[PDB]
Amino acid sequence: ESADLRALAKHLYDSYIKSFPLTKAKARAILTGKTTDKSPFVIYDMNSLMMGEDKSKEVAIRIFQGCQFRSVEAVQEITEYAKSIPGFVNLDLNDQVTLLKYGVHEIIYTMLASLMNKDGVLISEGQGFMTREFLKSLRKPFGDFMEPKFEFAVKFNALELDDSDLAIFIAVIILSGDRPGLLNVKPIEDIQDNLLQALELQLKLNHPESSQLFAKLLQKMTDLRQIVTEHVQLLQVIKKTETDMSLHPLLQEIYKDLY
Ligand SMILES: CCCCCCCCC(=O)O
Ligand SMILES: CCCCCCCCC(=O)O
Ligand SMILES: CCCCCCCCC(=O)O
């Protein structure tokens, strides 16, 4: 069984690497000054934004729109990864859609942590770095979007997970049998069972000194789902205050009738 679990962990890490262009490994090399990668241009105000703006008439809106395109791009990457999770594509098509609908954002903020430190977040495939203070200074409610993600990331990052850990963890998230409107819960839970087994052994092997890291990681789901509920509330505000703004269709279908 252990051999089967090792094989599963390796398959997922392989697909993860193939699906996600900017890994945590690379992100850290950029943030911490490694010679394997290149230094980011740092955006911390209006001017540095304009100078860096080489890589709807208001910086706050423009940044939001930009972040929105990246979210769309991420959903595409996550969708591709999901298909590699054994059993996923064999599930009822309606459930596949539902799993992605509720799962993508929890994964987005999980992986966004990889791009974050206390001071800011990597952007533009790691070529840029936008500071936390700059984002927090944006006119309401745009300045309220990222702060909670930073708070979560600082805590999540303390777990010191690597890409091979994350690959299994995000698979676990996708295969959540508690998603609203699931037609066949059992098949989903059977898959998650295996993934959980795989994650458990992976953490034991990769972090033999970090006791109950498995339990601690699973508990991070609480903060994760808290983030999304808060995020949704913020989107509802802008929808009413900025009637000239359009949320990307892919992103609309995700939030439509969400919780
Ligand atoms: C000022 C940065 C705010 C980014 C918000 C991203 C919204 C898109 C999403 O819901 O996936
Ligand atoms: C602040 C811009 C990034 C917010 C959009 C979500 C990014 C997706 C990701 O990189 O995981
Ligand atoms: C110039 C506004 C922000 C651009 C977002 C590009 C990707 C950001 C990220 O990966 O978190």
114 known member of a binding site: no
| Ligand 3 centroid – CA 179 distance (Å) | 29
Nearest CA to 247 among 68, 34, 55, 15? Answer: 68
Give this entry's resolution in angstroms: 2.1
CA distance 132 to 196: 34
φ and ψ at residue 128, rounded to 5 degrees: -120, 165
Q: Which amino acid is at 91?
A: L
| Ligand 3 centroid – CA 187 distance (Å) | 36
Nearest CA to ligand 3 atom 4: 66
11 known member of a binding site: no
Nearest CA to ligand 1 atom 1: 64
Q: Which ligand is nearest to the CA of 60?
A: 1
Classify residue 45 by its DSSP letter: S
CA distance 14 to 108: 19
> Which alpha helices (H) appear in 113-160, and where do they start and end?
132-136, 147-157
Classify residue 211 by its DSSP letter: T
Share in percent of the chain as helix, strand, coil (round to 5):
70, 5, 25
Domains and CATH numbers, the chain: 1-259 (1.10.565.10)
Q: How far is the CA of 31 from the CAs of 23, 26, 47, 108, in angstroms?
A: 12, 9, 22, 19
Nearest atom (ligand 3) to Cα of 53: 1
139 known member of a binding site: no
| Ligand 3 centroid – CA 166 distance (Å) | 21
| Ligand 3 centroid – CA 125 distance (Å) | 8
Experimental method reported for this structure? X-ray
